Each structure stands twice: as C-alpha cells, then as structure tokens.
Amino acid sequence: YNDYCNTFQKVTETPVQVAFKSAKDLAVLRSKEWFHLEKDVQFDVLTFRCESTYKFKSANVYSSIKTTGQVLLELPTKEVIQVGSVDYEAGTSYGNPVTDYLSRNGKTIEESVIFENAIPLSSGEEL
Amino acid sequence: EPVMADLNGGLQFIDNLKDFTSKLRTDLLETADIRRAVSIESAIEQKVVNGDKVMVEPRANMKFDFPTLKSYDEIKQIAPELEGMLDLE
C-alpha cells in the first residue's frame, strides 16, 4: 500500500513525570519552544500528558507531526492544576521532539520493575 | 632600609577573597552549564526533528623541478653589459 495520504497515527503518550531540580533543568524547559506556561508558579515536578498525531508522506517520513498536551502540577494543597500546555507542530520530520525529551528527561508513572529471575507459574501439564 | 613593595593591585581590600573568587567561579560555571545544557538539548531536538563539506586531503607533489628560468628581458635587466662578452666554451 502506497496511499500515505490516508495514513495517520494518534498516540496518547503515557503521563511522564519530569523533575526539574536545577536551574539548568528549568532553563532547558523554557528553551523548548513547544512548551508554554499559562500559570506563573514555582514547580519542582511536572506531569506531561500529551496526544501526538502523526501524518505520513512516506514510510520513514512524517507529513506532519502535531503534539498537544496539558502539563500539570501538584500544588502543596495537593490539588492538580494545569500550569501550561504543549503545542508542537511541524511538517517533514523524522521524530517527535516532545516524546524524545520526555522519554530522555522524564520517567513515566508506574514504571515496570522487572524481576531478576522470572517466576514460572503452573506447569506444562496444567497449562 | 628594607623595602616592602605591595604590588597586589588592591586585592587586600576584598573581604573574604577566597569566598568571593569561589562565588564568581560558581556563577560563571553555573551560567556555562545552563547554556551548555540548553544548547545540547536544542541540538538533540533538531536532530530528532530533522533526522540524521568534503575536505580535499593533501598529497605530496614531488615535481623534481629544475631551477626556474627568468625571461630574457629580466635577465638583461639584472646584467645588461654582459651580452656576448664571455666565452661559453
């Protein structure tokens, strides 16, 4: 199939918790053009919930990447409020910078901890 | 009499010179690290977004060249009075 005009990929990225424990960390966040702050507050941890939308012009090339998301902060009150948004838009591209940044600099909620030794359940007779 | 010459340039008047030098170094290094991190992250963003000059390598040119010959006019300018005076044999 070569009808790349009709392809798309909606990926709801799992919430990524990014900890900004350094002035350089805040600096890189503010250097991200796709990140906008709508509530001027002091935060040490944020939660990025994004919904990437890819459109393909070829197998390896994205016709258009659009990532929209809501960045959340847990206040000392423990209320969760949207301190900002993610709004990335690009044409011909080879990846999503928002997903790359959150993957490298952030840990997803509910990380999967893998045992050193797998525990076999039941047996080849019962299963 | 013995001569004490203080050529310190007024650094004796800085209170806590060590702490002040450390403060300046820490501020400068903090700025450098912040801008380094911002530049590296921006570069990675451009790399992941836009995806992933030929220099000629010199070679020896052993031109076993004879002594360069000047034009006859330039030779005559260097020695005009010598024409047809010496026995070439």
Residue A44: partners with Cβ closer than 8 Å, 6 or more residues away? A19, A20, A21
Distance CA B30, CA B22 (A): 12
Distance CA A126, CA A30 (A): 57
**Which CATH number applies to A1-111?**
2.40.128.700
Complete edge-to-edge strand list for the sheet that includes strand A80-90: A35-37, A80-90, A62-74, A45-56, A9-19, A107-108
Burial class (CB in 10 A: 0-12, 13-18, 19+), A98: buried
Q: Which residue has the tokens 């000059």?
A: B53
CA-nearest of A94, A86, A99, A101 to A56 is A94
Strand partners, A90: A65
Å from B3 to nearest chain A CA?
51
In Å, the largest CA–CA distance within chain A is 62
For residue A31, give the 3-state DSSP assignment. Answer: helix
The torsion angles phi and psi of A81, rounded to 5 degrees, stand at -130, 150
Distance CA B21, CA B11 (A): 11
> Quick one: chain A helix, strand, coil %, rounded to 5?
15, 40, 40
Q: Across the interface, which of B34, B51, B52 has its CB nearest the CB of A27? A: B34
Strand partners, A87: A68
Distance (Å) of CA B17 to CA A61, B5, B26, B28: 58, 20, 14, 16
Å from A5 to nearest chain B CA?
20
Contact (CB<8Å) B38/A95: no
A113 and A98 in contact (C-beta within 8 Å)? no
A68 and A90 in contact (C-beta within 8 Å)? no
Burial class (CB in 10 A: 0-12, 13-18, 19+), A51: middle
Residue type, A110: E
Distance CA A81, CA A10 (A): 25
Contact (CB<8Å) A93/B49: yes
For residue A71, the tally of other CB atoms under 10 A from its CB is 23
